[PDB]
Amino acid sequence: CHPQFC
Amino acid sequence: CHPQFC
Amino acid sequence: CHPQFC
Amino acid sequence: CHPQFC
Amino acid sequence: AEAGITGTWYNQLGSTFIVTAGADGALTGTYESAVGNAESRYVLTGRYDSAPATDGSGTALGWTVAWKNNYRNAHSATTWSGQYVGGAEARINTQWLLTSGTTEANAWKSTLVGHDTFTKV
Amino acid sequence: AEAGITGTWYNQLGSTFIVTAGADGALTGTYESAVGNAESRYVLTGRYDSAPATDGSGTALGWTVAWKNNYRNAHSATTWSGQYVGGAEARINTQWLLTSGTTEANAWKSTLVGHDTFTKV
Amino acid sequence: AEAGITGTWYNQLGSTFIVTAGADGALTGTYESAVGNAESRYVLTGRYDSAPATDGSGTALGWTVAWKNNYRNAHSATTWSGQYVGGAEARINTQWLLTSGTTEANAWKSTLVGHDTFTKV
Amino acid sequence: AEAGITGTWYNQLGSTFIVTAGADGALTGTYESAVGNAESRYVLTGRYDSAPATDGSGTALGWTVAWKNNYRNAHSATTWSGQYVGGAEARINTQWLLTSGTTEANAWKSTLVGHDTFTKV
Predict the structure, then answer these.
(1) What is the Cα–Cα distance from H5 to G16, expressed in whole angstroms?
(2) Can chain F be said to touch chain C, i.e. do they have 3 or more Cβ pairs within 8 angstroms?
(3) How far is B6 from chain H (nearest CA, A)?
(4) Is the CATH number 1.20.120.80 carried by domain G1-121?
(5) Helix (H) or strand (E) holding F111
(6) Which of E79, F36, G74, G102 counts the most CB atoms within 10 A of its CB?
């Protein structure tokens, strides 16, 4: 649940 | 006018 | 241990 | 002679 | 997969390819960079990885076109890497790499990167 | 080119491929991810663009390996894009794309990028 | 350019960034990976190349986000490279690279590639 | 990290950059594409993600250079994405993206990809 999208 | 698209 | 290198 | 290398 | 991949695919810009997915991982066909003319037509070859899917995964695949035929020799080749997703709106989403043959001075500027989506419609 | 490409190639990390360059642009052979074992062995297929060179240019090429054989099915495929340069120290310089089959939630993290150089020694 | 770039941008997936384009090539602001929460918020910094355009060219630019703030430290950074195109439907089209910090064994799988388009609406 | 990153770095081809890593994730300095001349010199800006490491991981980072100064305006920008690894032979391994401003007809050929390693020596 990476920072970039979540 | 490269092969890929033209 | 992907196929590519291992 | 792009900026990056030249 | 396989039967799903076999057929005609179209991108946003007017290019078409036709592919047969063979029983042991083979992908063969022709890429036509413009749907009209009979040689904007170039040979394609690639591979796909078939597997039992239980969770709605795509099928990983790739192919190469070298840009030479009876009418043109562009001194370059493209590889597309991506995945097939089936269903009512089946698509193939790809990223690509185009390399041109250069002198060694120019080698650092030899490869472009981009992306393409193909649909059956 | 052609006769120049045909043979055995090695990278920095211990991988080997064996390729035949055929008369009309075909590239076929096997990639062995570790030189020892008889199946770290996978089928390869690709294309190269042959041309008259007067200025010491490389030859553009590409190939695909899907990561499935009788021992492993990794649900992924790699494409290598690059060029062959001949001579006393012939090499193939490449950039590559590895895509894995994902669910659609995970599609944005499906593709890795890197680079490889191959030599005859 | 400059005044054109300054403002709020949105992508297809729900992420937002806010940027000021400064007089001597500077780009500063915040990226919020989800429009709701006050820290999905991370610092951004980048540069743009301003020029006299007579032929409807885009403006080349880039920026970096490291994925650390008061709530999360993901041990990774993304760079976006692309161009701004203005008008009634102004957009920024980008390709990106995400690298994670790895051990040296894992270094070959450290970098993902993808693409994004941002609009004002 | 931080103190480790701060200093002068060199690549294989003759380029140099000088960077200060600041306490809250900031990276600032100058890239000189040729060590001689006082303007092959361009501003750089980026970010790094600092973390407690117990397993010999690299530190993820990125930076941007827009290719404009008092002597040249190349209508382009590069982003480098990678990681710092310290020690006796500290290096920064990167992949990069260079985008040029194009007309919309030419947008598909706007971005080159490559890679660079930097050392302190």
Answers:
(1) 30
(2) yes
(3) 11
(4) no
(5) strand F111-119
(6) E79
